[PDB]
Symmetry: D2
Subunit: 512 residues, 4 copies
């Protein structure tokens, strides 16, 4: 048995589970994109190359920390590492750059003497919180300076406040005039500049602030491919982000992050306005009750899938791997279930940004994802997506559905799509074919953005535009055709699907 084809033949979803077999190997090609956060541990060109070698598709730069210089250098290294393989088109793996925005986050100040210094909060022990900037440099076990100045106006008496990943929780004994006197609920070591969450509270921090505008404009200067926009709450917040990106940045994909109750509620509004969604479980698990996350996640992946847009699952997928070389059984199951849910990309934060084993964590996700894709019940996924798919006037859309249906019949090895903007390829992916979609394009940016979609393998053709069109099409097709054989997606005999143009033509041919 190969790539769980026995499990795929069952009539029921239950029979399908029963036939899943651990002694049935997947198809080398992994379809779920891997997004790694680049930080102190993965920043070197040297380790960065190993990362690309291990499976990284997108590099995430977290702008809640670090100066532009720091990030501009990170960006340069990501590109040095990526172009190191440019010599040969069979080794060249396009890598995209994504910018995560700080956004409307509330942070505590610097602990006494220095941030490295720590402190311990013990239960019951009240604690003082002032917006008095004299204490920012002096954060201690008795006084905690906040970042959000117009706090109290939004926090009533009795409410809660979670500091540091929500690990530390407090309780407002009374709303002060310009200060708060709390009481630890469950202490712990309070370092410095630890995020703060005000669930139940109605924060008014600007969706996009000054710092966000400069970082956002910086991304346009830097030529990033996508923006992960933090704390999106309404469709109007995404518009401000497009606005800022201006005309120069109009092609940058915008990924709205859902991290709170409102965003969850205004999801439909937000999805329509975005290019894609990121299920940002970290904050969302503090903003709403932790047992609800799985529901918000499946709700979001389901709708994005249905809508044909990228959805990224993120935060704490391999937490444990920050300190250890192997993941726990919960984390192992986490990644698999995300892929099986329908997530286009899975992500890594601390695991690659500051952990001791970023390469093992990237390698782990390539492994799990590959297994998880083989275990997908397509006979039901494809049938369900079609039935829910609107009746179209667009030829390319009918070409896409027709192409994925043929790929299941002849069990095809690949769906070669020639596209300039990537749309044709995106249209093929929403129907979730089992065959890999090799997207041949001359646009290096659409090639990078291809990674936000499940099953799209971008192959950047450099060859000059042939004088004659028919020839230029035949050229880009032999390109995929040779790089494909070279990369091992198929051999001279295999049947393959090819989509060219406006993309409205489909051909089922033998590999040359």
């Amino acid at each position: 048995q190969t790539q769980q084809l026995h499990a795929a033949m069952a009539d029921t979803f239950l029979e399908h589970m029963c036939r899943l077999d651990i002694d049935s190997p997947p198809i080398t090609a992994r379809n779920t994109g891997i997004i790694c956060t680049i930080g102190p541990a993965s920043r070197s060109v040297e380790t960065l190359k190993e990362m690309i070698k291990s499976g990284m598709n997108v590099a995430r730069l977290n702008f809640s920390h670090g100066t532009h210089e720091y990030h501009a250098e990170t960006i340069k290294n990501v590109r040095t590492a990526t172009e190191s393989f440019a010599s040969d088109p069979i080794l060249y793996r396009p890598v995209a750059v994504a910018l995560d925005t700080k956004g409307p986050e509330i942070r505590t100040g610097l602990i006494k003497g220095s941030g490295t210094a720590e402190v311990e909060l013990k239960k019951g022990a009240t604690l003082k919180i002032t917006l008095d900037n004299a204490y920012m440099e002096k954060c201690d076990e008795n006084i905690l300076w906040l970042d959000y100045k117009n706090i109290c106006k939004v926090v009533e008496v009795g409410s809660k406040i979670y500091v540091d990943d929500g690990l530390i929780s407090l309780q407002v004994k009374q709303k002060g005039a310009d200060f708060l006197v709390t009481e630890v609920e469950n202490g712990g070591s309070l370092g410095s500049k630890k995020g703060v969450n005000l669930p139940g509270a109605a924060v008014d921090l600007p969706a996009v602030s000054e710092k966000d505008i400069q970082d956002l404009k910086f991304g346009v200067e830097q030529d990033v491919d996508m923006v992960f926009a933090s704390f999106i709450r309404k469709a109007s917040d995404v518009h401000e982000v497009r606005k800022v990106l201006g005309e120069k940045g109009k092609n940058i994909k915008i990924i709205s992050k859902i991290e709170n109750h409102e965003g969850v509620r205004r999801f439909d509004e937000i999805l329509e306005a975005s290019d894609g969604i990121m299920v940002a479980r970290g904050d969302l698990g503090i903003e709403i009750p932790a047992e609800k996350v799985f529901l918000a996640q499946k709700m979001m992946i389901g709708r994005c899938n249905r809508a044909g847009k990228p959805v990224i699952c993120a935060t704490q997928m391999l937490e444990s791997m920050i300190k250890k070389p192997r993941p726990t059984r919960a984390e192992g199951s986490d990644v698999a279930n995300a892929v099986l849910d329908g997530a286009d990309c899975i992500m890594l934060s601390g695991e690659t940004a500051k952990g001791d084993y970023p390469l093992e964590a990237v390698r782990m996700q390539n492994l799990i994802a590959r297994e998880a894709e083989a275990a997908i019940y397509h006979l039901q996924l494809f049938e369900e997506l079609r039935r829910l798919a609107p009746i179209t006037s667009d030829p390319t859309e009918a070409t896409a559905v027709g192409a994925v249906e043929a790929s299941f019949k002849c069990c095809s090895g690949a769906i070669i799509v020639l596209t300039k903007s990537g749309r044709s390829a995106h249209q093929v992916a929403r129907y979730r074919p089992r065959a890999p979609i090799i997207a041949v394009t001359r646009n290096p940016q659409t090639a990078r953005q291809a990674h936000l979609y499940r099953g799209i393998f971008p192959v950047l053709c450099k060859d000059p535009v042939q004088e004659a069109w028919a020839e230029d099409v035949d050229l880009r097709v032999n390109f995929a055709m040779n790089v494909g054989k070279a990369r091992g997606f198929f051999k001279k005999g295999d049947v393959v699907i090819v989509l060219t143009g406006f993309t409205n033509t489909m051909r089922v041919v033998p590999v040359p």
Copy 2:
């Protein structure tokens, strides 16, 4: 609401029925082929032209009557009426000719005394049967001659003999040398040369006889498109008809007619050797109990639909119309239901061979069939043929499932197919698309044979072949593009699927 689009969109089959609206006009394109037996009532060249305008697609010659001169003349008139519309591709409709063999049937002699003056076989009275040629034309209420010279060897006291399509039944009450002395079960009128049935007896008549050998060679000399073979009891039978049709008729489609118990048992063996099947309910309903015929029919249409081979439902579909201008409600229910079960073709015998309302009978099948195609539940159907269809390495087989999936997506006006042998079109049709399948060919015979498959509309091209293959292709695509708009299959703006080629190229293009 139109073409049952409100119903063919329901989640359950029951729900589908509840939504059938008799006020929802169908698509002017009728998919089910109509086969008309020709005879005194339709032989006139002039009325033959009318049969065609009324919907006839295939002219059936019943070789169980008449001479080779007679049929040769029917064939000429049929071709005259057919080619009289050829002067214009917009009005031209190819008409196939079918040759129905007599096979091993058994008939009674001629009535004596007063003309054919039916004889009254009274219940309970005895009836002596002889093979003595002395009375071969002196039949009456006491003696009935028969042409089965080896009958006493396969009967016995108790045996049951059925006369004139099973309306008269006899029970052998005393065998003899060259005669039987039966007793009349339920009576009726006995006319001349009525067919006889021996259900339970082993009639040693050969599948193909010398007489049948003659006719088959005649069919080949005359250039028929298909042979409807009578009493196919085993795959061996079908193999003999192939031997005779030999090399010159190796292209003639052989439809095996199932009309006996053995044939229904060794059915799958028969379907393997045949190009198509025909449910001959006439004899079948005498050879097996009448109450079971509907089972044999739904089973054969079912197995033929899977197998992807043409199937024909025939005999007594509109009996009442031999004498009446309108059909009974049972007759209308019958035809509708045959189409709904999946019959590729419906056929008329007496109705057009000798009836008083041949034309009214053909128009009634066009009307019933059209309404029934709209009410089809393409939802469950398509998905079901997809599931039950084996995977293949075949390029054209996937380009078809692809063509059909994509035509459902964009409610395409039609699926245009360039093919030389027609297989390319037979492949799309086995998936039962809603959209009409226009087959464009230069081969006149494949145009005629396409009538045997549900949904294919023959559009025969005449323009010469361009040395420029590429160019030659657009010449025929446009061909169908005009004949299509004209006949009102679609409007310019519409979206159309074009399957060119070695058919591996599918295209979704807006009509010019």
Copy 3:
């Protein structure tokens, strides 16, 4: 393989058809009830006993002919034959009495002063229609009188008029003011008092005429079980029949006959008001075009099944058998498809009212019905009837779905239900169990009315009530038990389901 068990055990519906085996008989039990129209060919108390022995469950009295005296005699005979078996509880079968109204029908008058006179009509010939009562007995090939004194007010020039079940068709050439000049469209033999249809015309005849009012009151007087209401066009029509039956006739079941365009249009409104529906195909096929009748029938049966209300399929199911001892193939598949569609009962009109083979017709329907009831794909029918079935608080409803689910799971030989009004047996029956629903009641009328439902076998208990409760219940449960084993339903070991009380108790017990 028996009762098509191999087939009902198939994943797909197409694979279900492929398994229908002609050599796989069912259970001697036939669920589809049979309604026979009583007439000259079947009134003899003698013939009525044979009708009952052949399968008749309901005697239908056509009040469009005969006097109250004539019908009191008919009813008297039916009850006489039915009670001839009342001596022995094992052979006693409740026969229901049905009164069918004349309703708003138009009939021509007498030919040449008599009701045995048949004039000949030639195509092309002209015919004058007059309303001068002085012609109601003066009808011939040049003049014709009609009941509808306001015919000219709704029939325009060019409108077509149908006489005698649509056999004769005329076209109005000169629309006057008191007379009409028509042209015979299709010839035929014209007899007296033939039915006339005016498709398109908006006839104003009362829903319930004065004659209808007397006949309905006569009904209550004669203690009939149901009323088949002709030409019902809307709910207020059904509400009139009810007002008439009044309190005294409040329990009589009312079946609305759908035989015109509007009844089909306002069907939902009509179903709400009626106790059940009859698909009167005869008139409907003349009122609306013939090619749409199956749509009307498939839709109506579908909706009644959804609603759990009896639905009857009628008219011309075995026409051929009026004059012949065997049905045509079209008639064979019509009676079967009627059952496969979901009709609670099938009917015979002329076949048993005036034909030559009343008994042969009945026996042929019992046969077809059984074969068709086994070929039923319950796997799909049951489940669709559940999803679509509403969530109630009613113990009995939940108990019925529970009982039917259990009957399939352990292949039960019967579901014995104890009911006074019949409602409990009705509720089990709407889910369509495969197992015969034996209904034990001490109430005679509900015993007879149970025939309107698919699969409810009425078994009337004549045994005196037990002074105690529990024991009375067992008296009845064991009653069903004895008669059950006796009539072949089951053996001594056999697993049965028993429902008792308010019916909220299910027991899966082996037969004693």
Copy 4:
């Protein structure tokens, strides 16, 4: 909308996910059993009581640590905690005791003199493994002793050896007679007596060693309710446990733990010989690659569901909570997905055996599981289980599917089952009703073992047996009603299904 009644009620699984709402609460009743390992952190009678209040249904005793004395005291406290609520049937909650065998596990010895001070092993360093008991309690970064005296014989040069949950990694460079020379793949800190895994090698230790026989016999003496058998490799191992348990322990449930490759390979025969299965992810993800664990899990849960046997998901479900008060997002997701897969019970090990937050750990599982249960897609689940479930002649099996169909059809607040052995309640549970299954029994051992099944709430009746069987029945039914009403399950109004006695009686009764 409450309890995902809008979501858990769609026509496609995809649409189902899309409708999941974070703003719709579930039915207080949590159906998934929670097994908690007892250790230093949860051993007191004091915290045991709270654990029961938090949701613990089964107490697990890990026999790979601790003496018989120690474990006897644990059982004493659990029983003490449990009985403290005995003083009122409304608060009493049966709590089961589970014995988890040591089985053939390999462990390291003790680290050198310098406290349990773990040692640092670095990638590259060389480590020698000795079997010389002289170094038994003198372990260091240079020499490591193990208790598997045959390690050298089952290992080859190049094999892989994992230490401490598979965190430390070693590869054999040189194989000696009584030693090994390894090189460290990835290191870490190694404390004392850590588990060792040899993936690939065929460990020749017996499944049921001498200590195991002693421990199982201790389990019988102590009246444990179930046994979790470690490292079952084949059915002969399960039988070996059975013999040891003997007659006294013939009612003790045997749950086989699949934690190695032979176990997963021969799973079908193991499932057959066992009372239930436990997916032991801990060892299983070292034994086989971690990336494959999820497939194994979904396969076993799916096959146990299909077989109607209990299946438990275990190990590292909330790992994080050993040191933090809140779980990671992977862990939240993991627990939820285990419930959605079909796991009957979820387990906690370190989280409750030695972590700082046992009570929070247990409460968090109660929360996730509840949310998870409301989001189950019962439509498909029930349908498939019914499809995949065999046809039976057993009355109770039929009564059980009947009770579940009814309980859906009338939104029952519960299915009350009267059972002595637990059997009839187990039969209802396998069909997975939405409504909670209340099993009334006088038998304390079946009331405790009932926690092994999804949705079965044990209610142990204390009342004495009435002389009147039928009076005893209503006594027990009334007990459920009261304890049920009093516990929140339903109200005076609501409908409930009641099954009684061979459980072949069902009654839909409103709550008194």
